[PDB]
Amino acid sequence: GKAHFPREGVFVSNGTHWFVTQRNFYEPQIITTDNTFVSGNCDVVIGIVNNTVYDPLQPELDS
Amino acid sequence: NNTVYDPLQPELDS
């Protein structure tokens, strides 16, 4: 429900998946908590979409 | 060939 924005680049997608990439060259990254910043929420941003932001720490805590 | 340190490792162990 929190709104994640790119730290840099743009959130883009193909027919099934969202990636974040630098504006001048397509090089899609997995959208993770290390790629986004959070500010405000989904009740405010117009055009916001529903997806999962990956947290690399979770599996490290479990492994 | 060298190494890169990951600060999380010792935190998981501590």
Add this chain to the structure above:
Amino acid sequence: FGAGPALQIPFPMQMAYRFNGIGVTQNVLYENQKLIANQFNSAIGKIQD
């Protein structure tokens, strides 16, 4: 559009870029998207007057 081939960008994202370019985080625009558009529209009307 003037760099070579033109690339389509949703207008509000062009603004997000422009705002980021002057030191303000690209969240300001969305929180204030309507405010910004309204101030803009007002300013243009003022110029014509």
